[PDB]
């Protein structure tokens, strides 16, 4: 219930369970990771999709179990000059295995010239930075894309939302529910002395 009060979104298409039925199914492990990309790069963040930033920084497999939460963020990461802190890596060797981060600083070689630190006509720096100005349009603005991934069959369920507690009714034959212990009866105060672990 504290998910949809975080500004209007930009992309919330999902490839699995409904976002409203997440309370009805209790999970055990959920993953959380976030990054920022240009608004022209939000489209290819999907299971089985190609593009510029599709196979060189972050890839998604066929099994997803979740979806992204992308919204507009132009008054924290946008300056009248530049915002060069965020960058994307596109001069990579080969295909990237999905759900695997990678950090490197060696200069990529696109030819047969052995580059061991130099940047020639074929060797380029593999880390290219963005540029974030108000002069740029809506399709050239940073969006804080965050994706949630769910894991199954590792442990019994431990993570899921509220249980909708209600009031108490006394001296009336009603049905109740106490931590999964169902039954019908009349609630009455006791005189026994329970041990503080039962």
């Amino acid at each position, epitope marked *: 219930s504290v998910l949809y009060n975080f500004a209007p979104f930009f992309a919330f298409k999902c490839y699995g369970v409904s976002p409203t039925k997440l309370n009805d199914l209790c999970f055990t492990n959920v993953y959380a990771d976030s990054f920022v990309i240009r608004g022209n790069e939000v489209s290819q963040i999907a299971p089985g999709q190609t593009g510029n930033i599709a196979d060189y920084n972050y890839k998604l497999p066929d099994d997803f179990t979740g979806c992204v939460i992308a919204w507009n963020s132009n008054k924290l990461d946008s*300056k*009248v*000059g*530049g*915002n*060069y*802190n965020y*960058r994307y890596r596109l001069f990579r060797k080969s295909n990237l295995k999905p759900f695997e981060r990678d950090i490197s*600083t060696e*200069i990529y070689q696109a030819g047969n010239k052995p580059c*061991n*630190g*130099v*940047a020639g006509v074929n060797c380029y*720096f593999p*880390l290219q*930075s963005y540029g974030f100005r108000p002069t740029y349009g809506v399709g050239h603005q940073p969006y804080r894309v965050v994706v949630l991934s769910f894991e199954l069959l590792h442990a019994p369920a431990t993570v899921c939302g509220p249980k909708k507690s209600t009031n108490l009714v006394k001296n009336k034959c009603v049905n109740f529910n106490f931590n999964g212990l169902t039954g019908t009866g009349v609630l009455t105060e006791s005189n026994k002395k329970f041990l503080p672990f039962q």
Partner: antibody
Amino acid sequence: VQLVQSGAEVKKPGASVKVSCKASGYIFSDYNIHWVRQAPGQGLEWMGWISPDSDDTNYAQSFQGRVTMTRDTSITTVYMELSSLRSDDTAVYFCARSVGYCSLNSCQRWMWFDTWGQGALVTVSS
Amino acid sequence: PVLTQPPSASGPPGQSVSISCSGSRSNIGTNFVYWYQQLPGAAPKLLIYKNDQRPSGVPERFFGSKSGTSASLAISGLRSEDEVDYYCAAWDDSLSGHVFGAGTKVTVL
């Protein structure tokens, strides 16, 4: 842009000095101001950047605690409290303007020093 | 490591002159080289940034280039009334600080 300030007063060894160059004509929350000294007859040495929003600054390999750093968003002017002035500190102090924003240690390679103007005179002398 | 520059540049007017700034393997090539020049008794001013763009305020008169370990700042002739010292700047990841050159002052013959 402008970088006019007042001349720094001469300090004996074992003292404290404060220098600050005025910032106006823009908003002081998007460009990180730098500082550098011009030693006579040789090059320059650098100690770190000042982001004018939060505490994320760093220090160089040769300057650990000899420089202490302080921001001020009410006046939009950075402040400095220099300590342990020796004979190697005798140089004019210039605040170097920078373009863009850089918080980490790998984002300033595209950054270039924008504007220099009217530094102060600092001479450490017994 | 330290960055070295010639103490002075011997340049006759009317002919092309250039300066070299040799550094280290982690200082030049992987990072861009910036050239700075200062007036005598005044503030410095950047000359070349990112090795192929030039700032607004200078005519099409100067050129800068980088080739491996050393970077060259080619100058198309020399004006006798305008002589300034030149600087070389780069970045080193191991030192984690900006490094500046010694300073090359052009001198007429």
